[PDB]
Amino acid sequence: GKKKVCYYYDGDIGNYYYGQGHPMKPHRIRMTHNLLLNYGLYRKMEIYRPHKATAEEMTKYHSDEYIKFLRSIRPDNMSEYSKQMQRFNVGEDCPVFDGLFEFCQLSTGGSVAGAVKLNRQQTDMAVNWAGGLHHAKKSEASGFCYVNDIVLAILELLKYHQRVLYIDIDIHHGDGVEEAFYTTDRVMTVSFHKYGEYFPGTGDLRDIGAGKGKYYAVNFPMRDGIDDESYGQIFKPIISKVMEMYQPSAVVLQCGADSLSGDRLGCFNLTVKGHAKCVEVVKTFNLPLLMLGGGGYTIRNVARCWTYETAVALDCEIPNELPYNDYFEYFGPDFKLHISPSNMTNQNTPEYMEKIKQRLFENLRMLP
Numbered sequence: 252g253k254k255k256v257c258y259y260y261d262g263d264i265g266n267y268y269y270g271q272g273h274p275m276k277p278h279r280i281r282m283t284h285n286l287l288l289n290y291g292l293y294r295k296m297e298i299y300r301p302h303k304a305t306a307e308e309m310t311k312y313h314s315d316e317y318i319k320f321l322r323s324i325r326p327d328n329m330s331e332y333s334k335q336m337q338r339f340n341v342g343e344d345c346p347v348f349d350g351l352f353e354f355c356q357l358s359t360g361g362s363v364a365g366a367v368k369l370n371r372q373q374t375d376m377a378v379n380w381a382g383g384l385h386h387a388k389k390s391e392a393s394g395f396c397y398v399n400d401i402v403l404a405i406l407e408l409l410k411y412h413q414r415v416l417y418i419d420i421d422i423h424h425g426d427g428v429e430e431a432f433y434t435t436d437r438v439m440t441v442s443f444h445k446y447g448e449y450f451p452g453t454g455d456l457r458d459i460g461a462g463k464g465k466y467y468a469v470n471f472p473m474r475d476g477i478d479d480e481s482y483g484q485i486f487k488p489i490i491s492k493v494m495e496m497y498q499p500s501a502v503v504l505q506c507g508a509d510s511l512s513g514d515r516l517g518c519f520n521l522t523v524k525g526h527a528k529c530v531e532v533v534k535t536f537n538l539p540l541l542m543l544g545g546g547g548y549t550i551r552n553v554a555r556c557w558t559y560e561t562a563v564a565l566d567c568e569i570p571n572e573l574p575y576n577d578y579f580e581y582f583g584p585d586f587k588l589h590i591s592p593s594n595m596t597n598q599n600t601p602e603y604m605e606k607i608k609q610r611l612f613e614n615l616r617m618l619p
């Protein structure tokens with residue numbers, strides 16, 4: 252039936268700025284919030300302002316030196332940290348910007364607070380669109396991510412859940428999360444991503460985990476142009492088999508919107524309905540679920556996507572005609588919620604999709 256949904260948002264999140272020309276735009280979180288408020292989606296959700304996660308909470312995964320660096324570096328003192336900046340990969344993709352640490356604290360706070368709420372059985376679903384920063388490593392920033400809120404949220408869920416399933420539908424491989432849990436069977440990581448001449452270069456079909464974690468990392472490598480039909484045909488069968496074999500007690504779903512058609516950095520062809528079908532599939536298993544954001548670089552489409560996925564979480568039908576909102580002009584020329592796919596060729600033939608699915612099924616047969 253219909254579930255209780257808790258949503259995490261801090262009104263200051265949209266003011267963090269990565270710099271001119273940087274594709275990562277925290278303002279998309281504020282556009283999402285304003286659109287979902289104007290659709291009236293606040294009437295059915297408990298809205299919470301996340302606390303600022305402490306350096307101590309972040310060191311449950313990240314190194315003390317790395318978190319100390321993030322808490323200390325500022326654009327005005329960067330000159331004195333050239334050595335640490337290289338060591339921690341702070342540069343073009345992961346720049347130093349005003350309020351960087353506070354941005355990490357808010358992104359992380361939402362994810363950890365959502366995990367605590369789920370652990371206490373006070374909600375069925377927890378949503379943090381500011382989270383899902385899946386590339387951050389133990390002592391290194393990567394791919395616009397500095398603190399891995401997902402790993403921290405999973406560590407929190409592991410306090411009450413023996414097995415946690417992580418699913419990542421961002422176009423980029425969820426490498427930081429996969430790496431963090433690569434040698435354990437208490438987390439199964441499943442990533443669907445573009446693979447081949449594409450960041451971060453990891454997520455081959457043959458990367459399946461190591462030691463006690465062997466068979467607990469699942470990667471579905473895809474080519475350009477995947478559409479709703481093709482994605483839908485492999486997502487539900489894979490997730491159903493993973494649910495059957497692994498029997499997780501909690502799920503974390505990274506909803507990176509850069510897998511949508513027309514994304515500035517992505518080359519997939521999903522519509523908002525095709526992307527949201529993943530949320531519908533996961534929600535059907537009736538397990539405690541933490542829904543997170545991630546990529547998404549055509550910001551009007553990210554706001555549409557996450558507003559629709561919040562409506563999906565709430566089992567609320569919302570009209571295609573967009574309500575008036577603070578960013579109404581960004582949704583022209585149509586002013587509709589749903590998007591059309593492009594004429595791009597789907598390089599993922601039906602035979603390729605079935606072959607990769609069958610290889611993943613062989614690996615899933617190896618679970619106990």
Ligand SMILES: CCC(O)(O)CCCCC[C@H](NC(=O)[C@H]1CC12CCN(C)CC2)c1nc(-c2ccc3nc(C)ccc3c2)c[nH]1
Nearest residue numbers: 271272273274343344384394395421423450509545546547
């Ligand atoms: C939030 C989750 C997520 O969606 O998975 C994150 C995606 C991260 C993508 C990172 C990717 N990085 C890369 O491909 C790494 C090899 C390089 C080195 C750095 N240059 C700037 C780009 C090539 C990349 N970087 C860019 C890019 C494009 C334009 C930029 N423009 C500016 C001004 C600054 C940084 C810029 C970075 C595109 N692709």
Ligand SMILES: [Ca+2]
Nearest residue numbers: 419421443444
């Ligand atoms: Ca992914």
Ligand SMILES: [Ca+2]
Nearest residue numbers: 432438464467
């Ligand atoms: Ca694992």
Ligand SMILES: [Zn+2]
Nearest residue numbers: 421423509546
């Ligand atoms: Zn991405």
